[PDB]
């Protein structure tokens, strides 16, 4: 295994180093506004060395943006695809590329058999070629790597089944900035080439000057280069026709034949296209070939890529004709005029890359190596696209909840083969497709119109209901004696209980377990653990009495804590934000212990008085002018007091001190250690009154943030043996710090209300001497080093925080893990900050046509980990990566993949069992089974089950941490007959495994295996 910590890779371009050296001046470069006047030697190309030009027709189809997916399919995409089939069938030399498989599958299934056969023929003969082949062209900033793989697999599995092809070239022309997580996943899924477009205009200028726009993109920790993927970066401002034929858009626009008038389009540079004739073909070819030779100067081979397309193009039959016939006249002239030394033709993306590598093998070019990312993107001036790292935060959090429910539903139902009548495959396919659709670059990014955001929410709600159904039918089958098991596949045997989604204060969705001497004395509950190691975690349920005790299924008592159910209200009469307690529902909390990828059953029983093994929390309400707070049967009366500083400690854990406003002030790790200053603060950013305005994509603050005026907020303190917390009602945010014995959990109920043109940020202030360095993650896969640059504006120093961020000095580290992707930065030494929500009245000129005024309450969750790191073996100063400690990685897993909770729905569960999975191996803490999925239906003689195994890399800081068991996924199901290593999409077998044993992977590696069973 390669050492991902101690060896700094040697690459030609390292993006953090490039950023430190570049000036980023925005000067007028001439007709190529952000470049320079390109010059070329006409003698470079000649009879023995011609320029080969591939014009590649394409149509960018967004799966929702200004219209919903179905509205665009009906108004535009079904006509584009129907006319592509007719035109390619009738014109054998015409070509076309297609990226979004969600639309293609929606079209194909509605076609008659004759047309399905015609479509398969133009794919088999190479005229219509699929690029990437994912369900969508995903966002690369907020998306989790697990969902980028899920949508890639959904589209490529459909393509293999119905079109018999698997793309090896990727096309990503519209995501707002680019992530190395893409070549990581693509290279492990059979790809050989990829293309990107939206990178900072200063970066395109710098790389073009050095002819470094084509490069071997490897991971930042990869010393050997085995992760490398050939990448082509487009050079200009847009992927549209005016910015794809060459450097001068006033010239290129004249070669977009849809812009002469009858289609309602024109050229903003004021010179229109003109129909090619025998009297003007020579002068038009002279202008076009000059643009092509200028573009060719920016690259190393004699093969040139010329995309020809735009949004929802190639719709009308007349449009197909106007572009094809005019280009065919240009090619016939150009290719017959020897003085140009050019051979031009329509081509596909794979054809371009195959010709580039033929040139490389002929020794005509060598390519540079590169590592790093391409965030944060700016397309012009100071217009940095960091706003979408936060826009529509409710749906960003919903993405992570659904991510976990799809994993748990596929894993729980994979253990058995299911009758078709159970509709398991049907519900899982719907769930995978709705979550895959939301990975689109106007979905999770929060950049679609209001009614489109509603469509994505409705689709994800249906996906959550599908997951719940599959999960609860699976738990009933896994924990019921086989000869008693009697399923009704439409029945609800268990209901899921989720404490953090939609969350307290967002939706009253949780069911109370109703017990009573005159109705039901007890209730079974079951916990599932999707991770491959034994896990303990506190769990809570709402119950109708405080006198409840817990037992495991051997009837052993389990220690429990009961607390009140508190809800916060904006009292429009007293003009205060304060908590009200329930006098009939209570929370019971206890530690559940669950096997690796397994289930554990517990029982809740009522008694007439306080049970021996259940304790009750105390509650203290701090505010001036208090009024009584009755709690029905709860045995401890609420106490009151004026605001004051307070300190709390649960278990042997850290001791936390809070200000009289209920915000963290310091953390003391041990009995003896110092009280380290760690302060939470809420602030607000505004919008500029003149110039460009912030919107769904852009963050254009009117200066540094100003503190939110807090007034004298109401603070609630609950102190218990197993769990304690401090909660405070601040303007727009109910802020809560929860302690269970380790790093605290932070929850913010954020309601920006009617505060227009405001962005609310949560900042941490410390005295850690971090200087200008901080770390953020990429897609929940890896941590990359960031350097704050004062030569760039505040918004350029904002980066995506898809799952975590940290700052450190020689001795101390502060890590903030998140349960949802948000935007953030470190704007000064010792600080971390992350945006909570943003409400904007204006549109930001990127096509959305509205502001963001549809905010709704959202419950954000986090873990805050303060640690000493002086003993950890860390990368050297020049290494571009960082790595988490064991405690920080487990804290991230507690947020993204918590235990699942099920409440038995009827009065008596006949045949109930106590545990499932006690014999599953408990794997080392850095290893995860990211995906477990049965790949065959019940009628297959040979069953197949696929697994994706990921190992992260944790710092060695002196903790022995030993004895774990080897995890061989191929022997998790009985009667294994074969074990194969496959691509990550499970579509190609790469290795037949000896002894049917699947080896574990190396740190930072991801592998896929399929076991076959007789
Ligand atoms: C974020 C947005 N980027 C693309 C914008 N496309 C351009 C035309 O090339 C456009 C289309 C419509 C209005 C303004 C600008 C869209 O595909 C969408 O995903
Ligand atoms: C699918 O493609 C393969 C390419 O290896 C070909 O050999 C096979 O016959 C194809 N099957 C069809 C035509 O469905
Ligand atoms: Zn788009």
PDB file of N, CA, C and O in Angstrom, residues 374-396:
ATOM      1  N   UNK A 374     -10.577  22.613  -8.460  1.00  0.00           N
ATOM      2  CA  UNK A 374     -10.928  23.832  -9.175  1.00  0.00           C
ATOM      3  C   UNK A 374     -12.097  24.587  -8.539  1.00  0.00           C
ATOM      4  O   UNK A 374     -13.082  24.931  -9.203  1.00  0.00           O
ATOM      5  N   UNK A 375     -11.912  24.836  -7.233  1.00  0.00           N
ATOM      6  CA  UNK A 375     -12.863  25.688  -6.489  1.00  0.00           C
ATOM      7  C   UNK A 375     -12.012  26.844  -5.881  1.00  0.00           C
ATOM      8  O   UNK A 375     -10.827  26.646  -5.590  1.00  0.00           O
ATOM      9  N   UNK A 376     -12.552  28.045  -5.682  1.00  0.00           N
ATOM     10  CA  UNK A 376     -13.913  28.446  -6.036  1.00  0.00           C
ATOM     11  C   UNK A 376     -13.950  29.138  -7.386  1.00  0.00           C
ATOM     12  O   UNK A 376     -13.173  30.057  -7.669  1.00  0.00           O
ATOM     13  N   UNK A 377     -14.875  28.694  -8.230  1.00  0.00           N
ATOM     14  CA  UNK A 377     -15.058  29.240  -9.565  1.00  0.00           C
ATOM     15  C   UNK A 377     -15.498  30.709  -9.636  1.00  0.00           C
ATOM     16  O   UNK A 377     -16.354  31.136  -8.844  1.00  0.00           O
ATOM     17  N   UNK A 378     -14.932  31.481 -10.578  1.00  0.00           N
ATOM     18  CA  UNK A 378     -15.452  32.816 -10.916  1.00  0.00           C
ATOM     19  C   UNK A 378     -15.445  32.846 -12.436  1.00  0.00           C
ATOM     20  O   UNK A 378     -14.429  32.469 -13.066  1.00  0.00           O
ATOM     21  N   UNK A 379     -16.558  33.236 -13.044  1.00  0.00           N
ATOM     22  CA  UNK A 379     -16.624  33.347 -14.518  1.00  0.00           C
ATOM     23  C   UNK A 379     -16.248  34.748 -15.041  1.00  0.00           C
ATOM     24  O   UNK A 379     -15.974  34.888 -16.261  1.00  0.00           O
ATOM     25  N   UNK A 380     -16.251  35.772 -14.177  1.00  0.00           N
ATOM     26  CA  UNK A 380     -15.841  37.150 -14.584  1.00  0.00           C
ATOM     27  C   UNK A 380     -15.669  38.006 -13.340  1.00  0.00           C
ATOM     28  O   UNK A 380     -16.263  37.714 -12.261  1.00  0.00           O
ATOM     29  N   UNK A 381     -14.807  39.028 -13.480  1.00  0.00           N
ATOM     30  CA  UNK A 381     -14.526  39.966 -12.406  1.00  0.00           C
ATOM     31  C   UNK A 381     -14.440  39.366 -10.990  1.00  0.00           C
ATOM     32  O   UNK A 381     -13.627  38.442 -10.773  1.00  0.00           O
ATOM     33  N   UNK A 382     -15.231  39.872 -10.017  1.00  0.00           N
ATOM     34  CA  UNK A 382     -15.230  39.339  -8.633  1.00  0.00           C
ATOM     35  C   UNK A 382     -16.492  38.464  -8.390  1.00  0.00           C
ATOM     36  O   UNK A 382     -16.839  38.238  -7.239  1.00  0.00           O
ATOM     37  N   UNK A 383     -17.111  37.968  -9.476  1.00  0.00           N
ATOM     38  CA  UNK A 383     -18.346  37.151  -9.375  1.00  0.00           C
ATOM     39  C   UNK A 383     -17.967  35.661  -9.083  1.00  0.00           C
ATOM     40  O   UNK A 383     -17.930  34.821 -10.010  1.00  0.00           O
ATOM     41  N   UNK A 384     -17.688  35.379  -7.809  1.00  0.00           N
ATOM     42  CA  UNK A 384     -17.333  34.021  -7.299  1.00  0.00           C
ATOM     43  C   UNK A 384     -18.611  33.266  -6.906  1.00  0.00           C
ATOM     44  O   UNK A 384     -19.476  33.818  -6.218  1.00  0.00           O
ATOM     45  N   UNK A 385     -18.717  32.024  -7.392  1.00  0.00           N
ATOM     46  CA  UNK A 385     -19.916  31.213  -7.192  1.00  0.00           C
ATOM     47  C   UNK A 385     -19.859  30.430  -5.902  1.00  0.00           C
ATOM     48  O   UNK A 385     -19.860  29.184  -5.926  1.00  0.00           O
ATOM     49  N   UNK A 386     -19.773  31.135  -4.780  1.00  0.00           N
ATOM     50  CA  UNK A 386     -19.780  30.465  -3.474  1.00  0.00           C
ATOM     51  C   UNK A 386     -21.152  30.519  -2.767  1.00  0.00           C
ATOM     52  O   UNK A 386     -21.310  29.885  -1.730  1.00  0.00           O
ATOM     53  N   UNK A 387     -22.119  31.215  -3.366  1.00  0.00           N
ATOM     54  CA  UNK A 387     -23.439  31.258  -2.731  1.00  0.00           C
ATOM     55  C   UNK A 387     -24.158  29.905  -2.742  1.00  0.00           C
ATOM     56  O   UNK A 387     -24.823  29.529  -1.774  1.00  0.00           O
ATOM     57  N   UNK A 388     -23.996  29.153  -3.842  1.00  0.00           N
ATOM     58  CA  UNK A 388     -24.704  27.850  -3.973  1.00  0.00           C
ATOM     59  C   UNK A 388     -24.158  26.769  -3.046  1.00  0.00           C
ATOM     60  O   UNK A 388     -24.700  25.655  -2.986  1.00  0.00           O
ATOM     61  N   UNK A 389     -23.074  27.049  -2.324  1.00  0.00           N
ATOM     62  CA  UNK A 389     -22.596  26.098  -1.328  1.00  0.00           C
ATOM     63  C   UNK A 389     -23.619  26.067  -0.152  1.00  0.00           C
ATOM     64  O   UNK A 389     -23.560  25.136   0.671  1.00  0.00           O
ATOM     65  N   UNK A 390     -24.528  27.049  -0.080  1.00  0.00           N
ATOM     66  CA  UNK A 390     -25.544  27.168   0.993  1.00  0.00           C
ATOM     67  C   UNK A 390     -27.001  27.279   0.541  1.00  0.00           C
ATOM     68  O   UNK A 390     -27.879  26.885   1.314  1.00  0.00           O
ATOM     69  N   UNK A 391     -27.279  27.796  -0.664  1.00  0.00           N
ATOM     70  CA  UNK A 391     -28.635  28.003  -1.104  1.00  0.00           C
ATOM     71  C   UNK A 391     -29.565  26.813  -0.903  1.00  0.00           C
ATOM     72  O   UNK A 391     -29.206  25.653  -1.212  1.00  0.00           O
ATOM     73  N   UNK A 392     -30.782  27.117  -0.421  1.00  0.00           N
ATOM     74  CA  UNK A 392     -31.814  26.068  -0.118  1.00  0.00           C
ATOM     75  C   UNK A 392     -31.239  24.976   0.795  1.00  0.00           C
ATOM     76  O   UNK A 392     -31.162  23.741   0.443  1.00  0.00           O
ATOM     77  N   UNK A 393     -30.815  25.366   1.981  1.00  0.00           N
ATOM     78  CA  UNK A 393     -30.223  24.434   2.924  1.00  0.00           C
ATOM     79  C   UNK A 393     -31.113  23.304   3.444  1.00  0.00           C
ATOM     80  O   UNK A 393     -30.621  22.222   3.824  1.00  0.00           O
ATOM     81  N   UNK A 394     -32.427  23.516   3.399  1.00  0.00           N
ATOM     82  CA  UNK A 394     -33.324  22.432   3.827  1.00  0.00           C
ATOM     83  C   UNK A 394     -33.106  21.181   2.961  1.00  0.00           C
ATOM     84  O   UNK A 394     -33.022  20.046   3.497  1.00  0.00           O
ATOM     85  N   UNK A 395     -33.042  21.397   1.623  1.00  0.00           N
ATOM     86  CA  UNK A 395     -32.890  20.249   0.689  1.00  0.00           C
ATOM     87  C   UNK A 395     -31.477  19.701   0.693  1.00  0.00           C
ATOM     88  O   UNK A 395     -31.263  18.498   0.408  1.00  0.00           O
ATOM     89  N   UNK A 396     -30.493  20.550   1.019  1.00  0.00           N
ATOM     90  CA  UNK A 396     -29.107  20.054   1.178  1.00  0.00           C
ATOM     91  C   UNK A 396     -29.070  19.046   2.359  1.00  0.00           C
ATOM     92  O   UNK A 396     -28.408  18.001   2.274  1.00  0.00           O
TER      93      UNK A 396
END
